Each structure stands twice: as structure tokens, then as C-alpha cells.
Design a protein around this ligand. Structure first.
Ligand SMILES: CC[C@@H](O)P(=O)(O)O
Ligand SMILES: CC[C@@H](O)P(=O)(O)O
Ligand SMILES: CC[C@@H](O)P(=O)(O)O
Ligand SMILES: CC[C@@H](O)P(=O)(O)O
Ligand SMILES: [Fe+2]
Ligand SMILES: [Fe+2]
Ligand SMILES: [Fe+2]
Ligand SMILES: [Fe+2]
Lengths: 193, 193, 193, 193
């Protein structure tokens, strides 16, 4: 819980920089009771800006004071059935470019975002890039032929990938996909980790 | 600024898990406008518990959604004059055990907590342990003789350290210090990193 | 190159601990020239055990002294065509349990090991566990029905997963797969990251 | 031990990328026995360049295949008496600029390099910079007055620090020290972490 994780972590950091309730309360313009209450799980209503200050006087970040994502696994694993996948339709330049079928995710590995992607367009000339993004990405061509584009949107490198091909795109590298010219559509599994 | 860092990071995570304002608003029981406002630096008054939920539906931590500690350096460095050091008097079992003179700290390395410590007691038999702590610690005997105790409080290892000696205590390892028997007091520099 | 990375990193560490060619040569029982030669890319023939000692006197690891995996990407990406996938047949208890079709890998993310796995057996009762392993694993059922087993081999949790289902198994968690009882075989994509 | 750590780690990586002795031996131009021997602690005489290749075919680094620095602590701590400190005399432009008295170091925190530094010169005009370096640095003025210079060697920022002052210099930031003009010499404790 936000409150408890904060309550425990706040007390940790405070002690770490050798401050008592009194000393910390003083730098924040609060009373010793207030601080003590926080360390007792009563910080729940603290605003983001307020958390910002507490973190500041303690010369650290809000992150260092809040608990980890939390656990959502069942004895080590988490499962997702095909019919419970969130479906988000991606739009680029008012066109239906992609369709994101979101696969299993877990708070134990927040950076893991697996997807089954429906590549809707089939005109390489109309390919639309993203500005690259954080985290690496593993790709597997699930169906059809994928026409891949990466690098500089103005003068990019290309590759026509057949069903079963696998790629890796490093973080920050810009990319774009479309079905092979005229083939209608294609599908690929995209795994961000 | 808490609000802006959050505003930027929220939009990052939302997009990362392929959600639009609508989709996210729905899982949270909020309106699309609200979410949009947040991504626009208006999340300042969000409570800790509320931040807890947003982090939860986005399968991540509050930390991943809040900005880093921030920068407080002057072209790479930060300086502290001897007369501006915070002074906290540590008490163990109602006795004045230590006196913490806090040295320079920086939000760029929150785990760095340097101290000039006044070891007040000089009776090894009355040594008082801490339950060990996170982070390693480098020590340098600034003055007098330090009588060091570490490990198991019931049956610990010991060492009489002269002025100029240097030690390293791994994280979680319990320790205690006092001036060499009868010598009155001693001083050591303690650096937690 | 091993030699150059080592040559550059050795000089870094040596300076870091304030040692000159003379000082380092002395602790190792070598001549100043020898050390200088190493820092000049001539360490190529140094044995593992010898590297072990150099690392030791420099109070660090061989890893800290050798260069990173290296880059093997083409402007950010690496591609693998379906016909160039390595094929390793996994055997457990003298039976053909799995068939590993290895997908694209990259020295820029060594922990990334994607696979198309052929689940050969279809008798849950004959399921064979692994002792769990380092790194998390994302799974997607490519075909048929997969009968999953994880946790304690003696009394494990189970799940019958249909085509299109996706799972996540945390690191160190033991697991086993087989095709749904009697269905012959199944295929799943396994991504270790 | 280099050999054993390598023997264990090699087997780990090999299995991780689904290769048997045969498969790995083949990519390296070795026999299955050879590889098996390595995994059995007999890799001791492998040269750096050879380790370089093994790492390469296994799409990773030598570091990932060699063991960590190792442990050198005595129940959590390591101690150094003042008379056993290594003494290195630093020279910049053929002048005796510094004198490094090396304090306790540990393979459990290789980046920790604490020093008692004798600042020999006392002419700010003759201050000599370093090109900055990896890792942050905590400083404490042990004696006299230190004249500090950091940033751009051509047009740097300055500070006259009295005994007891403490500073922090971020990694890569260039710096230089000398005793306050005419005061002869000064001493400071420098802790790289
Ligand atoms: C397959 C498309 C994904 O990689 P994107 O979210 O557009 O970067
Ligand atoms: C010198 C005293 C420190 O080691 P402490 O914060 O009491 O563990
Ligand atoms: C699908 C089987 C893999 O997860 P394994 O290499 O046996 O752990
Ligand atoms: C006190 C001198 C150190 O900061 P250096 O190793 O010369 O950068
Ligand atoms: Fe992407
Ligand atoms: Fe301590
Ligand atoms: Fe596995
Ligand atoms: Fe330095």
C-alpha cells in the first residue's frame, strides 16, 4: 500500500540522514506529530507537490520514498487468456495504422509490454514512423510479409520480412511497419522489455 | 517539479502500455479530461493513495511515474562550509552515545551520507549496536582510539583502531563504536554510500 | 577487441587506485615494461588465471577489466530470416521433450533469448521440470493447447492454455510444458529477457 | 577461482542459448571434449583473445563469463592500520603535486577508493587539472586551506575551502587542488565511490 510503503521508507531515509521527527518537521514547516503520523501510515492524503518537498529536504526522490510496483503473480506466474486482451487502435495521421492486442503484463517487470500487432496498411510509401522509444523491442512476424523501416525517416534502411522472421530494434531507434506492398495486412508479435 | 515530472512520465507510461486518455480514464473511474489535465501538469493535488492506484492500473510503481531527485550542483560540484553542518545528537538507551555532524549531501547521489561523528562514550562494555543498515559504509578514525564492535551483538568481533585507521562495514552488518577504554572520547569520519 | 578493451580498462583501473606501472608491476611480480605492454594491447595471450590475479591485486573483477559484449546491430537493428534459425533438440530423461528454434539474438542485449519451441510430448503425467532459471520469461501459445506446470514439481499448480494465451514466469520459478493431453503436439514462443 | 567461475558461468550461458557441447564446439572450431573440459575448470590457460571469441560466439561479454571480484571481508568488515597504507607520489608536469596515501579498499565495492591526499603545491596559478574521471568523489579538508578549481581549465570556477569543509565533485567534472596561496601545504580526504 502507498501509505505503508511510504511510512516505512520515510522512516528509513530520515534515519539514514540522521534526522529525528523534530529535525525533519522543522525543515518542512510541520510539527513533529505530523511527521510521526506519516511514518505511521497516515500520509495517504499527501499531495504530489508535498511529496515533492519531503523528497527534496531529504535530498532524494519521491521514488526512493514510495514502495515498488507490488506483486501480482500466482506462485511465480501470471496468465492471460486470448479473450481478455485489451484492444487499442493506434492512429497515425488520421489513418488506422495499427491495432494493439495487449498480452500479459506484470508489476514484477513493468518494462515488459508484449503485443500482437495488426499491421493494417500495405503501402510502404505511406509508412509512418514513431520517434523511437525507451527500451529494446523483440519482434516476430506472425503472418504475411512485413515491410520494415528504421533509422532516419527521410532516408531509412529497409527490409522485407517473411512470416517467421525475427528482429530486434534497439531503444531510441525509430521504426515503422506496413504489410508487404499490396498484400493487404500482416501480423507481428512485438515484445518491449 | 513534481507536477511536470509526473505529467511527462504519466504520458510516457500510458503510451507504453498502449492506452489513450479514454482507456486510462476508464480503468481509474475518471473522465478523459481529468487524465489529460494530469498530463498537463495539473496533478499537483493528487494524494499518495491516488497516485498509488494510477501506478497500479498502469502496472508499475509511483517511483516510475515521479521524476528523479533533481539537480542541486553548481557546474558539477556542491560545497559545505564547516559552520553550516547540521548537528544531530544520537541517543541510545537514554545516553548521549554519538553526535552527528552532517557533511555535504547531494540529490545527485542520495545514498551519499558523509558524517563527522563524535564518539562520546568510552566504555566498550556499554557499547550499543544498531541493527545494521542498507548501504556500505567507509570509516576513518579522525581522532583518539576507536573500539569497534561488529557482527552478533551477543558474541561480536572486536578491533581497537588507532587514529588514521580506515575500515569498511558491509551493508546489513551490525556495528558499534566507543572510544578506547578510559580515553574519554574519539572522532571518526563516516561515509555512507 | 579483447586486447584493446583490456588495454584501455586496465589503465583506467590502475590509475583509479593510484598505481603507476612500477607499483602494479611490483604487486604482480612482473616488470614495468610488461604492464606497459598490456596497456598497449599486448595482453592477448594472458591466461584466465593470470587475468584472475591482475583483477585481484586491483581489487576488482575480470569483468570490470574486459570490454562489453560489443555491437552487432545495423543502424539499430538486427534481423533473422526463418531459415537461419539454429535448431537444438532438448532431451529430458532420454525423450525428445522440446525442439528449440532459436530466434534473433544481439550482443547489445545478451539476456535476450527468444525461441519458437516445439512441445513434443502430450502426456501431462510425463511432464518434466527444469530447476527454474535466471531471467524472466514471456510466453505466447503459438499453436495447439499447452498444459502448463509450475512451482513445486511434487505438488505444482497447473493451467491448460489455448492458442493465443500469454504467460509470464518469474526468474527461478520452475516450470514444464506439454501439449494438452492426447492432442499430439503444441508450439509456443518463449522469450527470455 | 577464475577457472571455476568461468567453468560454471560458461555452462550457464551455453545452456541459456540452447547449445550443447557439440553445437558450441562447432562454432568455435574446437572438439566437444575441449568445451566439456572448460566447463570442468580446465579453462585456466585460455588466452584473453580466446576468451574474447568464446564470448563472441555466445553473443555476450567476457565479463558475463568470468566470476565477480570475490570476497575479502572478515564477517562483513575489512580494516586497515595507518602504517600499511600504500604511498604513491603523483606527478604532474614534473612537479610533486600530490602524495596519495591509500586507505582500505574491498573487492566487494571495487569502485570505492578512499585516500588521504597531501596537497604539496601552494600556488593556485600553478594548479594542474585532471581530465575529470569516472565515479563521484566526496572530499573533506583534513588540514590547512585548500584552493579548489573545477570545470573548464581555461576559465574555471574556484573556492577557498577551510579545514573541515566538505565537497562533492560529480563524475567527469575536471578538478584541481593546491594549498591556499603561500600556506605551504594542505591535506584532504578524498573518497571515490
Ligand atoms: C510494431 C509497432 C511497435 O513497435 P510501436 O509501438 O509503433 O513502436
Ligand atoms: C559511526 C556510527 C555509524 O556507523 P551509525 O549510523 O551509528 O551505524
Ligand atoms: C518453453 C520451455 C522453456 O521455458 P525452458 O528452456 O525449458 O525453461
Ligand atoms: C584530491 C585529488 C583527487 O581529486 P585526483 O585523483 O587528483 O582527481
Ligand atoms: Fe516500437
Ligand atoms: Fe553505520
Ligand atoms: Fe524457461
Ligand atoms: Fe578526483
Amino acid at each position: 500500500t502507498a501509505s505503508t510503503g511510504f511510512a516505512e521508507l520515510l522512516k528509513d531515509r530520515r534515519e539514514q540522514v540522521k534526522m529525528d521527527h523534530a529535525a525533519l518537521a522543522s525543515l518542512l514547516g510541520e510539527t513533529p506529530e505530523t511527521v510521526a503520523a506519516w511514518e505511521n501510515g497516515e500520509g495517504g492524503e499527501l499531495t504530489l507537490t508535498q511529496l515533492g518537498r519531503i523528497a527534496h529536504v531529504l535530498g532524494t526522490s519521491i521514488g526512493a520514498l514510495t514502495p515498488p510496483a507490488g506483486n501480482d503473480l500466482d506462485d511465480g506466474v501470471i496468465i492471460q487468456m486470448p479473450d481478455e486482451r485489451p484492444i487499442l487502435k493506434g492512429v497515425r495521421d488520421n489513418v488506422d495504422y495499427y491495432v494493439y492486442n495487449c498480452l500479459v503484463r506484470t508489476k514484477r517487470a513493468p518494462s515488459l509490454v508484449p503485443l500482437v500487432v495488426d499491421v493494417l496498411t500495405d503501402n510502404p510509401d505511406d509508412a509512418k514512423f514513431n520517434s523511437g522509444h525507451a527500451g529494446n523491442e523483440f519482434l516476430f512476424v506472425l503472418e504475411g510479409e512485413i515491410h520494415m523501416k528504421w533509422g532516419d525517416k527521410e532516408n531509412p534502411k529497409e527490409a522485407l520480412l517473411p512470416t517467421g522472421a525475427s528482429m530486434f530494434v534497439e531503444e531510441h531507434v525509430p521504426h515503422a511497419f506496413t504489410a508487404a506492398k499490396g498484400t493487404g495486412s500482416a501480423k507481428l508479435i512485438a515484445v518491449n522489455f
